[PDB]
Structures are given as structure tokens and as C-alpha cells.
Amino acid sequence: ALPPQKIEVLVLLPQDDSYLFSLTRVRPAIEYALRSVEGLLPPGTRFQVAYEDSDCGNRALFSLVDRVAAARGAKPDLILGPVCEYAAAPVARLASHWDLPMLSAGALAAGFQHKDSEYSHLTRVAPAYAKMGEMMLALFRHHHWSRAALVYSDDKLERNCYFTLEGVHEVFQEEGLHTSIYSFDETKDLDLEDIVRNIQASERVVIMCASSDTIRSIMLVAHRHGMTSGDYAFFNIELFNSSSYGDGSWKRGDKHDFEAKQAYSSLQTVTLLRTVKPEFEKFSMEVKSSVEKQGLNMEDYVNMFVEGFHDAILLYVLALHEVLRAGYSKKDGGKIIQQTWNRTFEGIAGQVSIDANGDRYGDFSVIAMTDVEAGTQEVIGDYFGKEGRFEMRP
Amino acid sequence: ALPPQKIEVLVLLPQDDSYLFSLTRVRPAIEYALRSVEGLLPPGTRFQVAYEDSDCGNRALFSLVDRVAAARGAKPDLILGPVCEYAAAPVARLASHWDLPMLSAGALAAGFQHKDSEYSHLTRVAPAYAKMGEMMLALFRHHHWSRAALVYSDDKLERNCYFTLEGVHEVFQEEGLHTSIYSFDETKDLDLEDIVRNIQASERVVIMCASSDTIRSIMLVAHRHGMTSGDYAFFNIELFNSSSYGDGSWKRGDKHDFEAKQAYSSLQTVTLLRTVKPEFEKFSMEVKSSVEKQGLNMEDYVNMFVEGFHDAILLYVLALHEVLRAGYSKKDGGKIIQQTWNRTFEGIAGQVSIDANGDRYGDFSVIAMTDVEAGTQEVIGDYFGKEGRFEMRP
Amino acid sequence: SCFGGRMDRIGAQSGLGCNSF
Ligand SMILES: *[C@@H]1O[C@H](CO)[C@@H](O[C@@H]2O[C@H](CO)[C@@H](O)[C@H](O)[C@H]2NC(C)=O)[C@H](O)[C@H]1NC(C)=O
Ligand SMILES: *[C@@H]1O[C@H](CO)[C@@H](O)[C@H](O)[C@H]1NC(C)=O
Ligand SMILES: *[C@H]1O[C@H](CO)[C@@H](O)[C@H](O)[C@H]1NC(C)=O
Ligand SMILES: *[C@H]1O[C@H](CO)[C@@H](O)[C@H](O)[C@H]1NC(C)=O
Ligand SMILES: [Cl-]
Ligand SMILES: [Cl-]
Numbered sequence: 001a002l003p004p005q006k007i008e009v010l011v012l013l014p015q016d017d018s019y020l021f022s023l024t025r026v027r028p029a030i031e032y033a034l035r036s037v038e039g040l041l042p043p044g045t046r047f048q049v050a051y052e053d054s055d056c057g058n059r060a061l062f063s064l065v066d067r068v069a070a071a072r073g074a075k076p077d078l079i080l081g082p083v084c085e086y087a088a089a090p091v092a093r094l095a096s097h098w099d100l101p102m103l104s105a106g107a108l109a110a111g112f113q114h115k116d117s118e119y120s121h122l123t124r125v126a127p128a129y130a131k132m133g134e135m136m137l138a139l140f141r142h143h144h145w146s147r148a149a150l151v152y153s154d155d156k157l158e159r160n161c162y163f164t165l166e167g168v169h170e171v172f173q174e175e176g177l178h179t180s181i182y183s184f185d186e187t188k189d190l191d192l193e194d195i196v197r198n199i200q201a202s203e204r205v206v207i208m209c210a211s212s213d214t215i216r217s218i219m220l221v222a223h224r225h226g227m228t229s230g231d232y233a234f235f236n237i238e239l240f241n242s243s244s245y246g247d248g249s250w251k252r253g254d255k256h257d258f259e260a261k262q263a264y265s266s267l268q269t270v271t272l273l274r275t276v277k278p279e280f281e282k283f284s285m286e287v288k289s290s291v292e293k294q295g296l297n298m299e300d301y302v303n304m305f306v307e308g309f310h311d312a313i314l315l316y317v318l319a320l321h322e323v324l325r326a327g328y329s330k331k332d333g334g335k336i337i338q339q340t341w342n343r344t345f346e347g348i349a350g351q352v353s354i355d356a357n358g359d360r361y362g363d364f365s366v367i368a369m370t371d372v373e374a375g376t377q378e379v380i381g382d383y384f385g386k387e388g389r390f391e392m393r394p
Numbered sequence: 395a396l397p398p399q400k401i402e403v404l405v406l407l408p409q410d411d412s413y414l415f416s417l418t419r420v421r422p423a424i425e426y427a428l429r430s431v432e433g434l435l436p437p438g439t440r441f442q443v444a445y446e447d448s449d450c451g452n453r454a455l456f457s458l459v460d461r462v463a464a465a466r467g468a469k470p471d472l473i474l475g476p477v478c479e480y481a482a483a484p485v486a487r488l489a490s491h492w493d494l495p496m497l498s499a500g501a502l503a504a505g506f507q508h509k510d511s512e513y514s515h516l517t518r519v520a521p522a523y524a525k526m527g528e529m530m531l532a533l534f535r536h537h538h539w540s541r542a543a544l545v546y547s548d549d550k551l552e553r554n555c556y557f558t559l560e561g562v563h564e565v566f567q568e569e570g571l572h573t574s575i576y577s578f579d580e581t582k583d584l585d586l587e588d589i590v591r592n593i594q595a596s597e598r599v600v601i602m603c604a605s606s607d608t609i610r611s612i613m614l615v616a617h618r619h620g621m622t623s624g625d626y627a628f629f630n631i632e633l634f635n636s637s638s639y640g641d642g643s644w645k646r647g648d649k650h651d652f653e654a655k656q657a658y659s660s661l662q663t664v665t666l667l668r669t670v671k672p673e674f675e676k677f678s679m680e681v682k683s684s685v686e687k688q689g690l691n692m693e694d695y696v697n698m699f700v701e702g703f704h705d706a707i708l709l710y711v712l713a714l715h716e717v718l719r720a721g722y723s724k725k726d727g728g729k730i731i732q733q734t735w736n737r738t739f740e741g742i743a744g745q746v747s748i749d750a751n752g753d754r755y756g757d758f759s760v761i762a763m764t765d766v767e768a769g770t771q772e773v774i775g776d777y778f779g780k781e782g783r784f785e786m787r788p
Numbered sequence: 789s790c791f792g793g794r795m796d797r798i799g800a801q802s803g804l805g806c807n808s809f
Binding site for chain 2 (some may be wrong): 062068069071072094098118
């Protein structure tokens with residue numbers, strides 16, 4: 001009743017493995033999803049995947065555009081990525097113009113929220129920074145806090161931390177909470193003094209985002225100012241790098257470890273609430289195998305990006321299927337994209353829900369030190385984005 | 395003696411005639427220049443000009459890419475515009491990637507200053523904000539002022555005034571001048587009370603940028619607060635439609651005209667220095683009539699963008715010539731862009747110089763109220779970017 | 789200040805939030 005459909009897919013992520021979502025780290029997860037899928041769609045249905053370097057910048061647009069201009073005026077069927085904010089905007093806009101469906105585990109900034117026009121064909125399968133903001137909001141109502149200090153590093157390039165706190169800002173502003181803003185370029189000489197003093201001037205609760213080592217330093221100077229130990233509540237966001245949100249975040253096998261350890265007693269770290277299942281185990285095994293066979297010193301496991309792209313593919317099929325039913329083709333991107341919104345499905349790690357606006361609902365955890373003597377850090381509370389409930393742990 | 399040439403140029407501007415640089419308004423200027431060049435180019439040469447709507451947005455990129463994709467890779471030999479900041483960035487980036495020369499009487503923002511990579515094929519024929527920022531620096535050193543309040547309206551859309559004052563901020567920064575920054579959305583619900591309060595709270599010298607009307611309101615509230623008697627020195631930037639003086643930029647035939655007149659006594663307006671020539675006269679008229687019998691009324695003297703685009707044509711022709719005479723072709727885009735830089739020529743309004751970075755040197759004037767009773771405003775001083783010296787009018 | 793050392797990425801999207809030192 002249907003011929004072997006053939007999907008031409010364009011994946012745009014960085015060739016450089018410095019990124020957690022590099023082509024080498026993600027490609028395996030994409031391939032995994034492509035087996036359990038080519039094993040819902042008519043038999044023979046194949047996916048032709050082109051893995052192109054986004055260079056986390058202009059390259060994403062150059063390659064997409066050179067590809068469509070070189071080979072006739074033919075557009076790929078699906079586009080995966082870019083992840084990087086400044087790299088995705090131009091591709092999302094073009095995708096919406098060409099009615100092509102675009103799915104990313106990134107493009108987390110607050111501006112992609114408005115999909116009435118330019119970003120209409122974009123569905124984000126990973127939690128946007130705004131979802132993270134709604135989380136802090138609940139964290140704040142819980143403690144009756146109403147004012148905060150947003151401290152972040154702004155490199156004026158990829159601006160990950162700036163877009164991150166922009167997510168908290170947007171939500172706080174629409175709700176009424178006041179917020180002192182303070183930024184610096186952790187790429188320059190850290191005047192970790194004006195920071196700690198501006199902090200001590202602004203508010204009692206501080207929301208931060210900068211490199212792991214930077215937050216460590218800031219937390220030290222603060223310590224040198226007796227700003228830890230109940231006076232101020234410090235928060236730092238580490239949503240993706242398992243290395244940075246793993247127990248003993250203070251410990252660096254260095255001289256400061258003793259001092260550092262004492263500062264973090266006032267520090268709380270925000271990260272994603274991950275869930276696993278048996279099937280998720282095979283996935284992690286095969287992915288590690290490829291990545292290692294690829295000479296890449298296996299990080300530690302599968303992050304939100306690797307996982308998200310795998311679920312992006314099953315999400316694309318789940319929508320192609322329903323578009324292919326109602327009498328449409330792989331060329332009605334707009335229709336496909338609408339079939340990815342407002343729904344729940346089964347990803348490699350558990351239930352995945354994309355909201356009415358095409359954005360994946362996010363669940364978060366708060367990591368705090370529950371034993372100052374030892375340094376035992378454990379999840380204190382969890383926030384479930386769909387339900388919108390924050391709740392401490394027993 | 396060479397074979398006739400066929401030059402394809404893509405003009406990307408807004409079709410909407412509310413902007414001063416709309417296709418309807420600029421086209422006449424382009425055709426004037428084109429006619430005046432033919433009799434530098436091999437005899438029989440011709441120009442194929444395509445006029446495409448930029449929508450002052452994503453459409454600039456949308457039609458450029460679609461046209462090249464349709465032509466199966468064929469590219470224009472010259473791109474004129476966009477003017478709007480967010481529209482020119484992507485076009486400038488592609489033009490560079492494709493080695494296509496791009497000239498514009500816009501793309502005034504600071505970021506376009508960096509042409510080592512991303513924006514190498516961009517030549518700005520109208521004076522950039524940073525240049526206007528150098529003028530202010532001269533004005534300031536002349537009055538021996540070293541601090542300033544920057545008050546501007548921020549659209550979060552086109553953001554002209556944001557980019558305008560960023561030009562001043564960038565210059566004052568490198569130099570050391572202290573600056574307080576304060577922004578508001580003049581479109582949204584205005585609150586002139588908070589504006590003036592921040593003013594008096596920070597610096598005695600204020601540099602503003604917003605609609606002529608919005609500035610007027612700010613000056614009324616300032617006057618009603620006694621800040622105009624001579625305790626503050628206000629400035630505003632109206633680089634493109636500063637023709638209200640001569641009758642009184644405060645005059646609105648409004649019932650506040652008296653207040654205004656007095657308020658504006660402590661206000662100075664920075665605008666472009668516009669020089670005349672017989673040619674400019676005849677050019678102004680024709681362009682004016684062409685526009686007139688088109689449905690639009692035009693300010694006696696054509697604006698900077700219209701004039702700038704005329705000189706862009708000449709400039710391009712002056713570069714293509716020298717490129718040809720050296721064995722290269724119109725397809726050596728970078729080589730053509732380089733011939734347009736660090737060179738001085740004769741535009742329609744007089745000399746035009748473009749620095750070693752491919753950015754035009756701009757001349758400015760400062761208008762002040764010379765007689766508070768009448769309300770007479772006059773250019774009290776001018777600045778000459780190339781010479782780099784500011785001088786009050788004898 | 790609400791500008792920072794630069795803004796490099798002018799013409800990108802980033803127009804939903806300031807900065808300041
Ligand atoms: C994951 O986070 C770790 C930090 O926990 C990053 O490693 C640090 O990288 C910086 C500069 O690259 C070094 O100066 C630090 O010494 C590193 N920390 C240690 C001790 O490992 C790591 O780069 C991150 N991984 C990714 C892919 O971003
Ligand atoms: C989302 O889909 C559900 C069906 O699963 C439907 O009941 C609900 O109304 C939808 N939400 C909207 C209004 O988009
Ligand atoms: C520019 O501003 C002046 C002053 O308000 C106005 O008279 C003129 O019509 C404007 N130019 C156009 C037509 O956009
Ligand atoms: C213009 O300045 C450049 C420096 O970038 C210099 O090389 C050149 O000689 C100057 N123009 C000429 C040829 O006089
Ligand atoms: Cl990317
Ligand atoms: Cl434009």
C-alpha cells in the first residue's frame with residue numbers, strides 16, 4: 001500500500017569533539033534509532049544521513065545553502081541540529097521558509113519560543129532554558145524568595161551562560177521577582193573581587209552560570225568574605241556535563257579542596273533529572289562502543305544531546321507515519337512538525353513530552369551538600385515540568 | 395578595448411516606503427548613477443538590476459538564497475544593501491563565503507567593523523555609528539567632559555538607536571570616558587518620569603537617541619523639572635532627518651511649543667554634515683520628481699541612503715575598472731572589494747573617502763539654539779572624520 | 789554597562805536581555 005519511502009537527512013553539529021554534541025558523539029545515537037526504526041514505516045524505507053560540520057557558527061548556514069544550490073534546488077527531508085544558538089537561528093529560519101521540519105536537542109535560547117513565524121518549523125526535543133527558569137520560579141515560591149542576583153560569564157561568542165540566565169530572567173520578570181544582573185567575560189582576567197563585592201551588595205540569593213572552575217573560584221573569594229554559611233544562597237547551573245554535576249563538585253585534588261569544600265556547603269547545583277530503563281542500557285553500551293572505537297576517549301556516558309537526538313528520530317518517524325496517513329508527503333514539513341507538538345512518546349530513557357508550542361517539557365533536580373563534614377552532595381528536590389510541581393526529597 | 399560587460403546586481407531593500415531607503419526611493423538614485431557611468435567600463439557594457447524586497451528582515455537572505463538556488467549556483471556580480479542591521483548580517487556573511495562584493499549605505503552597527511573573516515566582502519558607503527562616536531569623542535574632549543549618560547530607546551526589533559549609541563559606547567570605552575547606560579522601549583507604554591530621574595541621578599551630560607517626538611517629551615519633563623536652565627547639557631542624534639531646525643525642531647504647532655522652545659535651549663542635535671554642489675542639485679530634483687510621480691513626497695534634499703547608493707554604483711564601477719585593467723574579472727569579488735577601500739573619489743554631493751577598513755569617513759554638524767527668544771537653531775560646529783578635527787563655525 | 793566589552797554577534801537574534809558591570 002506504500003512504496004519504499006526514502007528520507008534524506010542533514011545533521012549539523014560540530015566536528016570538533018570539544019562539544020558534548022559533536023558529530024562523533026551524536027552520530028552513534030542517531031544510527032541506533034535508525035535501526036529500531038528500519039526494523040511504523042513501509043518496508044524498504046531508508047534514511048540517507050549527511051553529517052555536516054556546523055562549526056557552532058556560520059558553517060551551518062553555508063553548508064545547508066551550498067547543498068541546496070549545488071544539487072539542483074533540492075532540499076534535504078529532515079534537518080537535525082544545529083545545537084549552538086547563533087548557528088540554529090539561521091537554519092531554523094530557512095527551514096521555516098522551505099517548509100522543512102527541523103529538530104534539535106539544542107537551540108535552547110528564549111527567542112526560539114516564538115514560533116508564530118520564523119521559528120515555526122522548529123521542535124526542540126531537549127529542555128529549553130525557559131523550562132529551567134520555570135523551575136527556579138517554583139524553587140523560589142517554595143522558599144518565599146522574591147529577589148535574586150544573576151551572575152554569569154558572557155564571552156560575547158557562543159554565550160551559553162548568558163542565554164542560560166536569560167531563561168531565568170524572562171520568567172522572573174513576567175512574574176514580578178526583582179533581579180540584579182551582573183556579567184563579566186571569564187575569558188579575561190577575573191576581577192573576582194568586584195564580583196564578590198557587587199554580589200554582597202545586590203541580593204541574598206545568587207543564580208550563577210560560568211565554567212566549573214570559575215564558579216569554584218568565585219565560591220572561594222566569597223568564602224574569603226565569610227559570605228558562605230547561611231548568609232547567601234548560591235546556585236550554579238550544570239545541565240549537561242556529568243563531570244561538573246557529579247558528587248564532590250568541590251574536590252579538585254588540589255590545595256584549595258579543603259577551603260573549596262567549605263564554600264560549597266552554601267552552594268546548590270541545578271541539573272537535569274535523568275531517568276533510565278533496561279533498553280537505555282543497551283543504548284549506552286553501543287554508543288560507548290562506537291565512540292571508543294572512534295578513538296575518542298569515551299567521556300563517561302550519554303548526555304542529554306546524544307539521548308535527545310536519538311529520540312528526535314523516533315519523534316520524526318512517529319510524525320511522518322501520521323502525516324503519511326492523512327494523505328501527505330515527506331515534503332509537508334509544516335504538517336510533520338505539527339505532529340511532533342503536544343504529545344508524549346517513549347524515548348530510550350523514558351516518557352518524553354513535547355508541549356503545545358513544540359518544546360520538550362523538562363524535569364530538574366537540585367544538588368546540595370547534605371553533609372558538610374564529608375562533602376556528601378545529593379539531590380534535594382525535583383521539579384517536574386509537565387506537572388509543574390517542585391518537591392524536596394525525604 | 396574589451397568585450398562588452400553584462401553586470402548583474404542584486405538590490406535588497408525594503409519595498410515598504412515608510413523607510414527612507416526603500417526600493418522606490420533608492421532605485422532612481424541607482425539609475426542616475428548607472429546612466430552617468432556609461433560614457434571606465436568597456437563600451438557596450440550593460441547592467442542587469444534586480445530589485446528585491448528585504449522586508450528589513452529575513453527576506454533579504456530568503457530571496458538571495460532562492461535566486462541562487464534557482465540559477466543552479468549562479469550568483470550576482472554585485473549586491474546592494476540591505477540597510478537594516480539584522481538583515482545585512484546574514485547577507486554579508488554569504489556574500490563573503492561566496493566571494494561576492496557587497497556595498498551598502500546601511501549596516502551601520504559596530505559589529506560590521508570586523509572584516510577579517512565573517513564580513514570581508516562588505517564596504518559601507520554611509521558613515522557608521524562608530525564614526526559618529528568619534529565625533530562625539532572630539533566634541534567631548536573639546537568641552538573637556540569625561541562622563542556621559544547614554545539614554546536610548548530599544549525596539550528589540552530593528553534597534554536603530556541601540557546600535558547608534560553602541561557606536562558612542564564603543565568609542566568612549568576604548569578612550570576611558572565613563573558612561574552610564576539607560577534604555578527603554580519607546581514603542582511600549584512610555585514612562586517619562588523614570589527617564590528623567592535616572593538622568594539627574596547619573597551624569598550632567600546626556601546623549602540620547604529616540605524618535606524626534608519621544609525626545610521632545612523627555613525634554614518637556616526635564617524642563618518641568620528644572621533641568622534645562624543650564625544644569626544639564628543634552629544631546630540627541632538625528633543623522634538622517636535633521637531638517638526641522640530652520641523653523642524649530644521643537645515646533646509641533648502643538649500647545650506645548652512654548653515649553654519645548656525653552657526646553658530645547660539646553661539641547662543639541664548631532665546630524666550629518668551635508669554639502670552641496672550643482673550636480674547634487676539636479677540629481678536631487680530628478681530623484682525627487684521620479685519619486686513624486688510615484689506616490690511619495692520627498693524631503694527637498696535626498697537622504698544619505700539615496701545619495702550613498704548613487705556613490706556605491708560609482709564606487710563599484712571605479713573598482714571593477716581597476717580590476718579589469720589588471721587582468722582579473724568581475725568574479726574576483728574580494729579583489730573588487732579591496733579596490734573600493736582606502737580610496738577617495740567624487741560622489742554626487744562632493745568628495746567621499748573610505749578608510750582602510752572599507753568604512754566611509756563621515757562629517758557631522760552640531761545644531762544648537764543660538765537665540766532662545768525666537769527659538770533659532772543653527773549649526774554651531776562641524777566635525778570632519780577624515781581630518782579628525784572638530785571646529786565650531788567661525 | 790548594558791553593552792559589555794563588545795556584542796560581536798550583532799545581526800543574530802540576541803535582543804531579549806541586557807548586560808552590565
Ligand atoms: C566537562 O567539564 C569539565 C570540568 O569538570 C571540563 O574540563 C575542564 O576543562 C578545562 C578547560 O578545558 C580545564 O582547565 C579543567 O582542568 C578541566 N577540568 C577537569 C579537571 O577535568 C570538560 O572540558 C567538560 N567537557 C566538555 C566536553 O565540555
Ligand atoms: C493535546 O493533545 C491532546 C490529545 O492527546 C488533546 O486532548 C489536547 O486538547 C491537546 N492540546 C491542545 C489544545 O493543543
Ligand atoms: C523624517 O522625519 C521628519 C521629521 O519628523 C519628517 O518630516 C519626514 O517626513 C520624515 N521622512 C520620511 C518621509 O520618512
Ligand atoms: C591607505 O592606507 C593603507 C594602510 O592600510 C596604506 O597601505 C596605503 O598606502 C594608503 N593609501 C595609499 C596607497 O596612499
Ligand atoms: Cl551546533
Ligand atoms: Cl534593508
